[PDB]
């Protein structure tokens, strides 16, 4: 990631690279240092793995900053959109259901993949008939905004689907 | 006098209302808000929709049933 700069470099002969791309060839390290000083820059060993180590006259700090910026860009472009989860229940009344649906819709709009689990608790036997029906209903409601990424998969005291946005 | 009159017909638990009242659809047909039995309440016997329960029903008003037996 990071390199040896001017005084950090202990190897005697190094291949000198310029601010833009000025090939100065294999010079002494001292000479390179002097050059850097003259430029008001620093020689930094950019290829320690190369023939008498490749070292660029550069503003090292500037380069570092650039690298950091690039990294940040990469991680900001990694898509902040993820999984929002919405545990339903068996006996969920209508208003509440609608609220949940609205929430789901909002999530979808934002860009999110939606874990639409149905929580079960007591009997957990008649579960698929009612729970599955509920899930189906939910899917129907979100025909336009959500494509079903998944299909209802019962693990614990529950069954989870995932949902995806219709169009990206 | 105490009249022996009631119908001991079964039914699917449709939906849970308050108190422990349910709109349960019978073997034969009509859904009546059926309240849970006292006995059931005493022995804490829960019910959820998706059940098949014994529901004693009145001659005076065949609209208010009574969920007798523990499922």
UniProtKB/Swiss-Prot annotation, chain A:
Transmembrane segments: none annotated. Its main location: cytoplasm. GO terms for cellular component: cytosol; membrane. Keywords: Cytoplasm, Initiation factor, Protein biosynthesis. GO terms for molecular function: ribosome binding; translation initiation factor activity. Pfam families: IF3_C, IF3_N. This is Translation initiation factor IF-3. It comes from Thermus thermophilus (strain ATCC 27634 / DSM 579 / HB8). The lineage of its organism: Bacteria, Thermotogati, Deinococcota, Deinococci, Thermales.
UniProtKB/Swiss-Prot annotation, chain B:
GO terms for molecular function: ribosome binding; rRNA binding; translation initiation factor activity. Its main location: cytoplasm. Signal peptide: none annotated. GO terms for cellular component: cytosol. It holds the Pfam family eIF-1a. It comes from the Bacteria. The keyword Protein biosynthesis applies. The keyword Protein biosynthesis applies. SUPFAM superfamilies: Nucleic acid-binding proteins. It is found in: Cytoplasm. Residues 1-71 form the S1-like domain. Keywords: Cytoplasm, Initiation factor, Protein biosynthesis, RNA-binding, rRNA-binding. Belongs to the IF-1 family. NCBIfam families: infA (TIGR00008). One of the essential components for the initiation of protein synthesis. Binds in the vicinity of the A-site. Stabilizes the binding of IF-2 and IF-3 on the 30S subunit to which N-formylmethionyl-tRNA(fMet) subsequently binds. Helps modulate mRNA selection, yielding the 30S pre-initiation complex (PIC). Upon addition of the 50S ribosomal subunit IF-1, IF-2 and IF-3 are released leaving the mature 70S translation initiation complex. Binds to the 30S ribosomal subunit, contacting protein S12 and the 16S rRNA. Component of the 30S ribosomal translation pre-initiation complex which assembles on the 30S ribosome in the order IF-2 and IF-3, IF-1 and N-formylmethionyl-tRNA(fMet); mRNA recruitment can occur at any time during PIC assembly. HAMAP family: IF_1. This is Translation initiation factor IF-1. It comes from Thermus thermophilus (strain ATCC 27634 / DSM 579 / HB8).
């Amino acid at each position: 990631k990071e390199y040896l700069t001017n005084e950090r470099i202990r190897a005697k002969q190094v291949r000198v690279v310029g601010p833009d791309g000025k090939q100065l060839g294999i010079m002494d390290t001292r000479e390179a240092l002097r050059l850097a000083q003259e430029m008001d820059l620093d020689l930094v060993l950019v290829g320690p793995n190369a023939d008498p180590p490749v070292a660029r006259i550069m503003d090292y700090s500037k380069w570092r900053y650039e690298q950091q910026m690039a990294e940040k860009e990469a991680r900001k472009k990694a898509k902040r959109t993820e999984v929002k989860s919405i545990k339903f229940r068996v006996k969920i009344d209508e208003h509440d259901y609608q609220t949940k649906l609205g929430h789901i819709k909002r999530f979808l709009q934002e860009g999110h993949k939606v874990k639409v689990t149905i929580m079960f608790r007591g009997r957990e036997v008649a579960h698929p008939e009612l729970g599955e029906r509920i899930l189906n209903r939910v899917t129907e409601d979100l025909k336009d905004l959500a494509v079903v990424e998944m299909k209802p998969e019962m693990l614990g005291r529950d069954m989870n689907m995932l949902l995806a946005p219709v169009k990206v | 006098a105490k009249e022996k009159d009631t119908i001991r017909t079964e039914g699917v638990v449709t939906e849970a209302l308050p108190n422990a009242t349910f709109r349960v659809k019978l073997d034969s047909g009509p859904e009546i808000l059926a309240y849970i039995s006292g006995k059931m309440r005493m022995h804490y016997i829960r019910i959820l929709p998706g059940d098949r329960v014994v529901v004693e029903i009145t001659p005076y008003d065949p609209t208010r049933g009574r969920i007798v037996y523990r499922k």
